[PDB]
Amino acid sequence: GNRRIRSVGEMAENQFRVGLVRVERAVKERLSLGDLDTLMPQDMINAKPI
DNA sequence: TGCATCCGTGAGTCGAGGGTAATAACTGCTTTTACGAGCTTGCGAAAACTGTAAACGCTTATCCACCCGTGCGAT
């Protein structure tokens, strides 16, 4: 009752939040630096770290 | 004199299957290094040709002694 089972769909979800933190670095470092009246969301979002 | 932080230990053969990925600038300007191009020597081959002591087969000049050109003889 003190030990718990963590299967594939949970361990793949913990590893998807780790990749999404790398979005929270590069987005907050783009909304202050980058242009405003031109920037689409496809431009700022990377695909490699996630 | 404990008390608290710290350094250093932890069996052996095999085995299977393999190697990663986040993100980073543009410009003009000047010096160095490579790549292909075109010669210059030179070096190993091909194809001819002028010096010597044997160089493949083959004639003679000799000498001489087996044999016998013949004759005549042996019982």
UniProtKB/Swiss-Prot annotation:
Acetylated on several lysine residues in the presence of glucose. Co-administration of salinamide and rifampicin or salinamide and myxopyronin suppresses the emergence of resistance to both antibiotics. The RNAP catalytic core consists of 2 alpha, 1 beta, 1 beta' and 1 omega subunit. When a sigma factor is associated with the core the holoenzyme is formed, which can initiate transcription. The rRNA transcription and antitermination complex (rrnTAC) consists of RNAP, NusA, NusB, NusE (rpsJ), NusG, SubB, ribosomal protein S4, DNA and precursor rRNA; S4 is more flexible than other subunits. In pull-down experiments interacts with CedA. (Microbial infection) Interacts (via flap domain) with Escherichia phage lambda antitermination protein Q; this interaction renders bacterial RNAP resistant to transcription pausing and allows it to read through termination signals. DNA-dependent RNA polymerase (RNAP) catalyzes the transcription of DNA into RNA using the four ribonucleoside triphosphates as substrates. Resistance to the antibiotics salinamide A, salinamide B, rifampicin, streptolydigin, CBR703, myxopyronin, and lipiarmycin can result from mutations in this protein. Belongs to the RNA polymerase beta chain family. This is DNA-directed RNA polymerase subunit beta. The lineage of its organism: Bacteria, Pseudomonadati, Pseudomonadota, Gammaproteobacteria, Enterobacterales. The gene is rpoB.
